[PDB]
Amino acid sequence: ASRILLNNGAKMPILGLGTWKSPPGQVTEAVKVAIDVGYRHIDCAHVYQNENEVGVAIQEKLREQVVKREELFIVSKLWCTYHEKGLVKGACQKTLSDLKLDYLDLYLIHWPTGFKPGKEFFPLDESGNVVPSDTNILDTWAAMEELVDEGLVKAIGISNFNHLQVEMILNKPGLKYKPAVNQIECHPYLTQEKLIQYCQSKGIVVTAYSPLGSPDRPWAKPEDPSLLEDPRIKAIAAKHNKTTAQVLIRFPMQRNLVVIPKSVTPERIAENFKVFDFELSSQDMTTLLSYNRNWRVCALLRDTSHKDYPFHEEF
Ligand SMILES: NC(=O)c1ccc[n+]([C@@H]2O[C@H](COP(=O)([O-])OP(=O)(O)OC[C@H]3O[C@@H](n4cnc5c(N)ncnc54)[C@H](OP(=O)(O)O)[C@@H]3O)[C@@H](O)[C@H]2O)c1
Ligand SMILES: NC(=O)[C@@H]1C[C@]2(NC(=O)NC2=O)c2cc(F)ccc2O1
């Protein structure tokens, strides 16, 4: 089945296109190709600095009647410098304008960490530390709930929240809407069994980011593990007559996760979508899970001092 049921009653395509690092002069065509080939979920963010260009593609394909808006599932995130109650609505509307939408299917708090508002996405003090905001994530969550009540977003969620932070929202006094999704890093080197189990036990759908290991991450090093070239994973792919990437995408799908591989390459975009025609065995799945090494691509290493930094806790 191509979609999963959220706790807001809407359905979310379990496969989406990521857009972090997608160059602004390539991402319009990437999203047009993705929708042409059958993608119905696009994962976006203001901090990616390319929403206008993603939006151009979405609008053209609506205009062309390639797809209807009801059939698309568009996701964006609230960046850390906009956690203040007075800035949330504005941030959302700028993203909407850029994406040329009148609503988001899903809007996520991008990180539990709030930063000082301003032009800079990573505001620094004179000694190099990121400057935090005094806003806490419970007041940020209430502002996200307002967005629902104003019709700007159909669902709200969180990203990069650890289990104690998910729990804090779940136990927020006067909680109005629970989070629908927690978007976290997840791949065979970071399998996240504990956090996923917790979120799913709570009815919260987990989206797996960097499922291919983010080989274009800016800080990659030639000696890092490589999922795509791990011969153990190659072997499993070979056996199923699929590519390694296809295996890496099918893997979270069979854990009842949503997954959002990024590509701006038309051939790979199509490749990545042909994952609905084969099944990994239970054994394949346990084998993939065994490769966990708690290897994190996205650890926000410029702000490990934040009170709300999520990755000091085990999960
Ligand atoms: N919530 C957050 O904090 C957060 C954090 C990280 C990522 N994300 C989201 O998750 C998405 C996915 O993560 P990611 O961008 O870090 O990386 P990823 O999706 O794990 O990997 C993308 C890299 O893989 C390459 N690639 C894609 N398909 C391939 C295939 N079939 N064969 C070989 N190489 C392939 C891409 O190349 P080309 O593009 O050159 O084809 C690109 O270099 C992001 O784009 C973003 O939407 C969210
Ligand atoms: N260092 C990190 O872990 C995050 C990763 C991350 N990528 C992503 O998709 N979400 C993120 O927040 C990102 C994206 C940016 F545009 C800029 C910084 C950046 O930092």
Side-chain angles (χ1 to χ4, degrees):
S2 65
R3 314 201 276 169
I4 194 169
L5 225 217
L6 262 26
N7 61 194
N8 77 335
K11 288 189 231 194
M12 178 169 191
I14 65 163
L15 180 56
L17 184 70
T19 61
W20 174 39
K21 309 173 267 58
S22 298
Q26 293 155 222
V27 74
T28 297
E29 177 66 6
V31 173
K32 293 180 180 189
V33 165
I35 291 169
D36 285 347
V37 152
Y39 293 68
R40 298 291 181 266
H41 167 198
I42 313 294
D43 178 77
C44 306
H46 181 63
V47 78
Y48 303 170
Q49 295 189 48
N50 56 192
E51 292 194 312
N52 189 41
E53 290 86 1
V54 171
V56 172
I58 291 167
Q59 173 65 7
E60 237 329 271
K61 293 291 168 195
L62 293 167
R63 189 204 64 92
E64 282 181 351
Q65 306 202 261
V66 169
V67 284
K68 297 177 297 134
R69 173 65 184 92
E70 35 261 82
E71 299 170 325
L72 300 175
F73 198 99
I74 313 295
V75 187
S76 200
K77 322 185 193 75
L78 175 82
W79 182 247
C80 301
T81 54
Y82 306 93
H83 284 205
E84 261 90 333
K85 64 100 196 136
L87 298 182
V88 171
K89 193 185 189 172
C92 191
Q93 295 175 121
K94 164 62 164 158
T95 274
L96 288 168
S97 171
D98 286 350
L99 292 169
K100 285 151 281 268
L101 296 176
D102 60 5
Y103 67 93
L104 257 26
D105 293 273
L106 183 62
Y107 201 46
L108 303 178
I109 304 180
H110 205 145
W111 293 84
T113 51
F115 303 169
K116 179 180 90 312
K119 271 124 139 96
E120 304 282 6
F121 290 156
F122 284 83
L124 313 175
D125 61 32
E126 340 4 73
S127 302
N129 307 290
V130 171
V131 186
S133 156
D134 69 8
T135 58
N136 51 246
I137 58 99
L138 269 36
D139 290 328
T140 305
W141 187 248
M144 302 280 289
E145 300 175 320
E146 281 184 40
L147 299 182
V148 176
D149 285 332
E150 297 165 312
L152 296 203
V153 314
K154 301 282 197 209
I156 50 182
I158 59 196
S159 184
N160 297 301
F161 283 48
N162 71 30
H163 88 281
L164 291 177
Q165 300 172 316
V166 172
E167 189 160 68
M168 244 129 53
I169 292 172
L170 249 25
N171 292 343
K172 174 180 191 298
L175 185 67
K176 186 174 196 187
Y177 308 112
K178 307 164 184 168
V181 166
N182 185 196
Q183 180 180 127
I184 59 170
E185 195 180 330
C186 188
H187 49 251
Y189 301 154
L190 188 68
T191 45
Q192 301 259 32
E193 273 103 327
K194 292 74 59 225
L195 185 51
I196 290 165
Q197 164 62 21
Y198 174 77
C199 290
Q200 289 179 158
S201 76
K202 293 306 183 189
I204 302 166
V205 169
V206 174
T207 295
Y209 79 56
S210 298
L212 309 186
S214 206
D216 55 344
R217 59 199 177 280
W219 45 90
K221 306 220 178 342
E223 83 261 13
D224 305 317
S226 157
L227 287 168
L228 269 34
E229 295 162 355
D230 187 319
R232 293 163 307 175
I233 311 179
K234 294 167 100 58
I236 281 158
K239 170 176 72 168
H240 288 272
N241 307 130
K242 298 299 288 209
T243 68
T244 66
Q246 284 168 329
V247 164
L248 286 173
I249 291 162
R250 183 71 190 192
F251 175 52
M253 288 168 67
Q254 290 189 208
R255 303 179 68 197
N256 310 315
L257 314 173
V258 176
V259 66
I260 50 172
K262 174 258 175 188
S263 177
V264 290
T265 307
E267 315 90 83
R268 285 164 168 184
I269 292 161
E271 170 175 322
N272 288 354
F273 198 71
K274 294 160 197 155
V275 292
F276 293 100
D277 58 348
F278 79 106
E279 177 173 48
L280 298 160
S281 63
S282 186
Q283 189 174 188
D284 289 328
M285 295 291 295
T286 296
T287 295
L288 255 354
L289 286 166
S290 76
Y291 303 157
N292 184 58
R293 51 179 326 260
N294 303 303
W295 183 72
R296 216 179 261 293
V297 169
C298 293
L300 205 69
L301 288 171
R302 289 298 171 108
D303 198 19
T304 63
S305 63
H306 208 291
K307 40 162 175 104
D308 300 323
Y309 185 79
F311 307 141
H312 307 320
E313 283 280 332
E314 194 270 277
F315 73 114

Short mmCIF file of all heavy atoms in Angstrom, two decimals, residues 17-22 43-44 48 77 108 110-111 159-160 183-184 208-216 228 243 245-246 260-265 268 271-272 297-298, ligand 1:
data_model
loop_
_atom_site.label_atom_id
_atom_site.label_comp_id
_atom_site.label_asym_id
_atom_site.label_seq_id
_atom_site.Cartn_x
_atom_site.Cartn_y
_atom_site.Cartn_z
N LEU A 17 10.11 12.54 -1.99
CA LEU A 17 11.35 13.11 -2.51
C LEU A 17 11.98 14.10 -1.55
O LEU A 17 11.38 15.14 -1.21
CB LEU A 17 11.05 13.81 -3.85
CG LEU A 17 12.25 14.39 -4.60
CD1 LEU A 17 13.14 13.30 -5.17
CD2 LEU A 17 11.77 15.37 -5.70
N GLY A 18 13.19 13.87 -1.07
CA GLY A 18 13.88 14.88 -0.26
C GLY A 18 14.48 15.96 -1.15
O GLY A 18 14.75 15.75 -2.34
N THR A 19 14.71 17.13 -0.55
CA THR A 19 15.17 18.28 -1.33
C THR A 19 16.30 19.04 -0.65
O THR A 19 16.71 20.09 -1.15
CB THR A 19 14.02 19.26 -1.65
OG1 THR A 19 13.47 19.78 -0.43
CG2 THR A 19 12.89 18.57 -2.39
N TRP A 20 16.83 18.52 0.47
CA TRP A 20 17.99 19.20 1.06
C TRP A 20 19.20 19.02 0.15
O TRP A 20 19.48 17.89 -0.23
CB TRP A 20 18.32 18.66 2.45
CG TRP A 20 19.58 19.21 3.04
CD1 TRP A 20 20.05 20.48 2.97
CD2 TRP A 20 20.54 18.49 3.82
NE1 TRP A 20 21.24 20.61 3.64
CE2 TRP A 20 21.56 19.39 4.18
CE3 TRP A 20 20.67 17.17 4.27
CZ2 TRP A 20 22.65 19.00 4.94
CZ3 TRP A 20 21.75 16.78 5.03
CH2 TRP A 20 22.75 17.71 5.37
N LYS A 21 19.91 20.09 -0.17
CA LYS A 21 21.08 20.14 -1.04
C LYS A 21 20.70 20.08 -2.52
O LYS A 21 21.59 20.15 -3.38
CB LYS A 21 22.09 19.03 -0.73
CG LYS A 21 22.50 18.93 0.73
CD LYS A 21 23.37 17.71 1.02
CE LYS A 21 22.53 16.52 1.48
NZ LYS A 21 21.49 16.11 0.49
N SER A 22 19.43 19.97 -2.86
CA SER A 22 19.08 19.97 -4.27
C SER A 22 19.29 21.34 -4.89
O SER A 22 18.57 22.24 -4.42
CB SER A 22 17.62 19.54 -4.42
OG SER A 22 17.52 18.21 -3.91
N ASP A 43 9.39 16.45 0.39
CA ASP A 43 9.81 16.91 1.72
C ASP A 43 10.64 18.18 1.55
O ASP A 43 11.61 18.14 0.80
CB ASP A 43 10.68 15.88 2.42
CG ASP A 43 11.15 16.38 3.78
OD1 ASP A 43 10.31 16.35 4.72
OD2 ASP A 43 12.32 16.81 3.92
N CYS A 44 10.29 19.26 2.21
CA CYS A 44 10.85 20.58 1.99
C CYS A 44 11.29 21.21 3.31
O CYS A 44 10.99 20.69 4.39
CB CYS A 44 9.76 21.47 1.38
SG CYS A 44 8.98 20.83 -0.14
N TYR A 48 16.44 25.01 3.59
CA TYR A 48 17.06 24.47 2.38
C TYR A 48 17.25 25.55 1.31
O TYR A 48 18.01 25.33 0.36
CB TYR A 48 16.26 23.32 1.77
CG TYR A 48 16.03 22.15 2.70
CD1 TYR A 48 15.15 21.13 2.38
CD2 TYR A 48 16.67 22.04 3.92
CE1 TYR A 48 14.91 20.05 3.22
CE2 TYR A 48 16.45 20.96 4.77
CZ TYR A 48 15.55 19.97 4.43
OH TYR A 48 15.37 18.91 5.30
N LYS A 77 9.07 22.37 7.30
CA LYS A 77 9.57 22.50 8.63
C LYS A 77 9.86 23.95 9.01
O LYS A 77 10.32 24.78 8.22
CB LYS A 77 10.86 21.69 8.77
CG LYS A 77 10.80 20.37 8.01
CD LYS A 77 12.00 19.47 8.21
CE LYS A 77 11.98 18.34 7.18
NZ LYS A 77 12.37 18.89 5.84
N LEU A 108 6.42 20.63 10.28
CA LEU A 108 7.20 20.03 11.35
C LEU A 108 8.06 21.06 12.09
O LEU A 108 8.62 21.98 11.48
CB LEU A 108 8.19 18.99 10.83
CG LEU A 108 7.63 17.83 10.02
CD1 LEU A 108 8.75 16.93 9.55
CD2 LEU A 108 6.63 17.02 10.85
N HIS A 110 11.43 21.68 13.03
CA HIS A 110 12.59 21.08 12.38
C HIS A 110 13.56 20.48 13.39
O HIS A 110 14.11 19.41 13.09
CB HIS A 110 13.28 22.11 11.49
CG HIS A 110 14.08 21.56 10.36
ND1 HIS A 110 14.17 22.20 9.14
CD2 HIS A 110 14.86 20.45 10.22
CE1 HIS A 110 14.94 21.53 8.32
NE2 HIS A 110 15.39 20.44 8.95
N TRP A 111 13.76 21.13 14.52
CA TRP A 111 14.62 20.72 15.64
C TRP A 111 14.01 21.16 16.97
O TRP A 111 13.35 22.18 16.99
CB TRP A 111 16.02 21.32 15.57
CG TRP A 111 16.81 20.81 14.40
CD1 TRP A 111 16.80 21.23 13.13
CD2 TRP A 111 17.74 19.72 14.47
NE1 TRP A 111 17.66 20.49 12.37
CE2 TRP A 111 18.26 19.53 13.17
CE3 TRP A 111 18.17 18.88 15.49
CZ2 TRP A 111 19.20 18.54 12.90
CZ3 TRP A 111 19.10 17.90 15.21
CH2 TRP A 111 19.62 17.72 13.91
N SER A 159 10.53 16.94 14.44
CA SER A 159 11.67 16.29 13.79
C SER A 159 12.87 16.34 14.69
O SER A 159 13.13 17.37 15.34
CB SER A 159 11.93 16.97 12.43
OG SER A 159 12.98 16.29 11.76
N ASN A 160 13.65 15.25 14.79
CA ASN A 160 14.86 15.27 15.60
C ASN A 160 14.55 15.45 17.08
O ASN A 160 15.38 15.98 17.83
CB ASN A 160 15.83 16.37 15.15
CG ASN A 160 16.35 16.19 13.74
OD1 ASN A 160 16.98 15.19 13.38
ND2 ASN A 160 16.07 17.20 12.92
N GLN A 183 10.07 13.00 12.35
CA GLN A 183 11.00 12.77 11.26
C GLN A 183 12.41 12.74 11.85
O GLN A 183 12.89 13.76 12.41
CB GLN A 183 10.88 13.85 10.18
CG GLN A 183 11.83 13.63 9.04
CD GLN A 183 11.80 14.61 7.90
OE1 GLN A 183 12.85 15.15 7.55
NE2 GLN A 183 10.62 14.83 7.32
N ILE A 184 13.04 11.58 11.66
CA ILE A 184 14.35 11.32 12.26
C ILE A 184 15.29 10.61 11.31
O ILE A 184 14.86 9.97 10.36
CB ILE A 184 14.13 10.44 13.52
CG1 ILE A 184 13.45 9.12 13.19
CG2 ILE A 184 13.36 11.19 14.60
CD1 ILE A 184 13.45 8.14 14.37
N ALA A 208 11.75 8.35 7.97
CA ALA A 208 13.18 8.11 7.89
C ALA A 208 13.87 9.07 6.93
O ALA A 208 13.63 9.00 5.72
CB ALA A 208 13.45 6.70 7.39
N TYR A 209 14.72 9.94 7.47
CA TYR A 209 15.57 10.76 6.63
C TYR A 209 16.99 10.20 6.46
O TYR A 209 17.44 9.35 7.22
CB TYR A 209 15.61 12.16 7.17
CG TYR A 209 16.37 12.73 8.29
CD1 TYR A 209 17.76 12.68 8.44
CD2 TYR A 209 15.75 13.42 9.32
CE1 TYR A 209 18.50 13.20 9.47
CE2 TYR A 209 16.45 13.99 10.37
CZ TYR A 209 17.82 13.89 10.47
OH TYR A 209 18.57 14.43 11.47
N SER A 210 17.70 10.77 5.49
CA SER A 210 19.02 10.33 5.05
C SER A 210 19.07 8.82 4.91
O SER A 210 19.96 8.15 5.43
CB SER A 210 20.08 10.83 6.03
OG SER A 210 20.12 12.25 6.10
N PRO A 211 18.12 8.22 4.19
CA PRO A 211 18.05 6.76 4.21
C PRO A 211 19.18 6.09 3.43
O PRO A 211 19.41 4.89 3.62
CB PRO A 211 16.72 6.48 3.53
CG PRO A 211 16.51 7.63 2.61
CD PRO A 211 17.10 8.82 3.32
N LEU A 212 19.80 6.89 2.58
CA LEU A 212 20.95 6.39 1.81
C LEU A 212 22.24 6.83 2.47
O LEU A 212 23.33 6.65 1.91
CB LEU A 212 20.92 6.89 0.38
CG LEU A 212 19.64 6.73 -0.45
CD1 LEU A 212 19.91 7.17 -1.89
CD2 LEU A 212 19.12 5.30 -0.41
N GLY A 213 22.19 7.45 3.65
CA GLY A 213 23.42 7.86 4.28
C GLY A 213 23.93 9.23 3.89
O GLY A 213 25.05 9.60 4.29
N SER A 214 23.12 9.96 3.14
CA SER A 214 23.49 11.31 2.75
C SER A 214 24.91 11.43 2.19
O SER A 214 25.70 12.19 2.75
CB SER A 214 23.45 12.22 3.97
OG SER A 214 23.20 13.54 3.46
N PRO A 215 25.19 10.68 1.14
CA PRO A 215 26.56 10.73 0.59
C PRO A 215 26.96 12.10 0.06
O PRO A 215 28.16 12.32 -0.11
CB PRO A 215 26.53 9.72 -0.54
CG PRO A 215 25.10 9.46 -0.85
CD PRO A 215 24.33 9.76 0.41
N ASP A 216 26.03 13.02 -0.22
CA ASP A 216 26.40 14.38 -0.54
C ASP A 216 26.42 15.33 0.65
O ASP A 216 26.48 16.54 0.41
CB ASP A 216 25.45 14.96 -1.59
CG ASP A 216 23.97 14.91 -1.26
OD1 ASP A 216 23.62 14.15 -0.33
OD2 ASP A 216 23.25 15.63 -1.98
N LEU A 228 25.73 2.74 0.49
CA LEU A 228 25.60 2.43 -0.92
C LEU A 228 26.69 1.48 -1.38
O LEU A 228 26.44 0.74 -2.32
CB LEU A 228 25.66 3.70 -1.76
CG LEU A 228 24.32 4.38 -2.08
CD1 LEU A 228 23.34 4.25 -0.93
CD2 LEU A 228 24.57 5.85 -2.42
N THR A 243 18.67 -2.61 -7.10
CA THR A 243 19.84 -1.85 -6.70
C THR A 243 19.91 -1.70 -5.18
O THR A 243 19.00 -1.89 -4.38
CB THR A 243 19.91 -0.46 -7.36
OG1 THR A 243 18.88 0.38 -6.87
CG2 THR A 243 19.59 -0.47 -8.85
N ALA A 245 20.33 1.03 -3.55
CA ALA A 245 19.47 2.14 -3.15
C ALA A 245 18.04 1.70 -2.90
O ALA A 245 17.37 2.13 -1.97
CB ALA A 245 19.55 3.27 -4.17
N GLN A 246 17.48 0.81 -3.69
CA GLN A 246 16.13 0.32 -3.73
C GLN A 246 15.95 -0.50 -2.45
O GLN A 246 14.91 -0.42 -1.83
CB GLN A 246 15.81 -0.48 -4.99
CG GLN A 246 15.62 0.42 -6.21
CD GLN A 246 15.59 -0.31 -7.54
OE1 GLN A 246 16.22 -1.34 -7.76
NE2 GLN A 246 14.85 0.26 -8.49
N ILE A 260 12.23 9.29 2.68
CA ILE A 260 12.34 10.40 1.76
C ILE A 260 13.70 10.56 1.10
O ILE A 260 14.37 11.57 1.33
CB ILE A 260 11.95 11.66 2.55
CG1 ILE A 260 12.65 11.87 3.87
CG2 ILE A 260 10.43 11.66 2.75
CD1 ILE A 260 12.39 13.21 4.53
N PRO A 261 14.09 9.61 0.28
CA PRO A 261 15.39 9.70 -0.41
C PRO A 261 15.44 10.97 -1.26
O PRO A 261 14.50 11.40 -1.91
CB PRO A 261 15.40 8.42 -1.25
CG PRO A 261 13.93 8.18 -1.52
CD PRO A 261 13.36 8.39 -0.13
N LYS A 262 16.62 11.60 -1.28
CA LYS A 262 16.86 12.77 -2.11
C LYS A 262 17.61 12.39 -3.39
O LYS A 262 18.64 11.71 -3.32
CB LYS A 262 17.67 13.84 -1.38
CG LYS A 262 18.09 15.03 -2.22
CD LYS A 262 19.55 14.93 -2.64
CE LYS A 262 19.93 16.06 -3.58
NZ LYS A 262 21.29 15.91 -4.15
N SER A 263 17.13 12.92 -4.50
CA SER A 263 17.94 12.88 -5.72
C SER A 263 17.54 14.02 -6.64
O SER A 263 16.39 14.45 -6.72
CB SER A 263 17.83 11.54 -6.47
OG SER A 263 18.59 11.66 -7.67
N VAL A 264 18.50 14.54 -7.40
CA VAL A 264 18.17 15.46 -8.48
C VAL A 264 18.47 14.84 -9.84
O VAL A 264 18.40 15.50 -10.86
CB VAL A 264 18.97 16.77 -8.37
CG1 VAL A 264 18.48 17.57 -7.17
CG2 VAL A 264 20.47 16.45 -8.30
N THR A 265 18.81 13.55 -9.86
CA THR A 265 19.08 12.80 -11.07
C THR A 265 17.87 12.05 -11.60
O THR A 265 17.38 11.16 -10.90
CB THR A 265 20.20 11.78 -10.80
OG1 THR A 265 21.34 12.46 -10.21
CG2 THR A 265 20.68 11.13 -12.08
N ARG A 268 17.70 8.29 -11.24
CA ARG A 268 17.69 7.80 -9.85
C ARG A 268 16.36 8.08 -9.17
O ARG A 268 15.82 7.37 -8.34
CB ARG A 268 18.78 8.49 -9.04
CG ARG A 268 20.18 7.98 -9.36
CD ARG A 268 21.24 8.92 -8.84
NE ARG A 268 22.56 8.28 -8.90
CZ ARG A 268 23.64 8.88 -8.43
NH1 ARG A 268 23.49 10.08 -7.91
NH2 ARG A 268 24.82 8.29 -8.48
N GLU A 271 14.33 5.33 -10.39
CA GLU A 271 14.82 4.11 -9.77
C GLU A 271 14.27 3.92 -8.36
O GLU A 271 13.77 2.90 -7.94
CB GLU A 271 16.36 4.17 -9.74
CG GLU A 271 17.02 3.09 -8.92
CD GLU A 271 18.53 3.02 -8.96
OE1 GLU A 271 19.09 3.25 -10.06
OE2 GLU A 271 19.18 2.72 -7.94
N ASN A 272 14.41 5.02 -7.63
CA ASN A 272 14.09 5.10 -6.22
C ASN A 272 12.59 4.85 -6.05
O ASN A 272 12.22 4.40 -4.96
CB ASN A 272 14.50 6.45 -5.66
CG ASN A 272 16.01 6.59 -5.55
OD1 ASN A 272 16.72 5.61 -5.80
ND2 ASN A 272 16.46 7.79 -5.20
N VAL A 297 24.72 10.99 10.56
CA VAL A 297 25.03 11.98 9.53
C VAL A 297 24.71 13.39 9.99
O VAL A 297 25.46 14.34 9.75
CB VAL A 297 24.23 11.65 8.25
CG1 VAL A 297 24.29 12.77 7.24
CG2 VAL A 297 24.75 10.34 7.68
N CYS A 298 23.56 13.56 10.65
CA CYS A 298 23.07 14.88 11.02
C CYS A 298 22.98 15.04 12.54
O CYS A 298 21.98 14.70 13.19
CB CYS A 298 21.71 15.19 10.40
SG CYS A 298 21.72 15.36 8.60
N1 LIG B 1 14.55 16.69 9.35
C1 LIG B 1 15.83 16.98 9.18
O1 LIG B 1 16.61 17.37 10.04
C2 LIG B 1 16.46 16.33 7.95
C3 LIG B 1 17.84 16.02 7.97
C4 LIG B 1 18.46 15.43 6.82
C5 LIG B 1 17.67 15.14 5.69
N2 LIG B 1 16.29 15.48 5.76
C6 LIG B 1 15.40 15.22 4.56
O2 LIG B 1 15.72 13.88 4.13
C7 LIG B 1 16.13 13.88 2.72
C8 LIG B 1 17.01 12.69 2.41
O3 LIG B 1 18.24 12.83 3.16
P1 LIG B 1 19.60 13.37 2.54
O4 LIG B 1 19.37 14.45 1.54
O5 LIG B 1 20.46 13.74 3.72
O6 LIG B 1 20.29 12.09 1.84
P2 LIG B 1 19.90 10.66 1.18
O7 LIG B 1 18.55 10.85 0.64
O8 LIG B 1 20.29 9.61 2.13
O9 LIG B 1 21.05 10.69 0.04
C9 LIG B 1 21.04 11.64 -1.02
C10 LIG B 1 22.38 11.36 -1.82
O10 LIG B 1 22.15 10.07 -2.49
C11 LIG B 1 22.27 10.12 -3.87
N3 LIG B 1 21.38 9.17 -4.46
C12 LIG B 1 20.00 9.19 -4.50
N4 LIG B 1 19.48 8.14 -5.08
C13 LIG B 1 20.58 7.39 -5.45
C14 LIG B 1 20.56 6.15 -6.11
N5 LIG B 1 19.49 5.46 -6.53
N6 LIG B 1 21.84 5.66 -6.34
C15 LIG B 1 23.00 6.30 -5.94
N7 LIG B 1 22.99 7.51 -5.29
C16 LIG B 1 21.72 8.03 -5.06
C17 LIG B 1 21.93 11.55 -4.21
O11 LIG B 1 22.54 11.93 -5.45
P3 LIG B 1 21.91 12.92 -6.58
O12 LIG B 1 20.96 13.88 -5.95
O13 LIG B 1 23.16 13.48 -7.26
O14 LIG B 1 21.17 11.92 -7.54
C18 LIG B 1 22.55 12.36 -3.02
O15 LIG B 1 23.94 12.57 -3.16
C19 LIG B 1 16.67 15.33 2.57
O16 LIG B 1 16.96 15.72 1.26
C20 LIG B 1 15.62 16.10 3.35
O17 LIG B 1 14.43 16.22 2.57
C21 LIG B 1 15.67 16.06 6.85
#
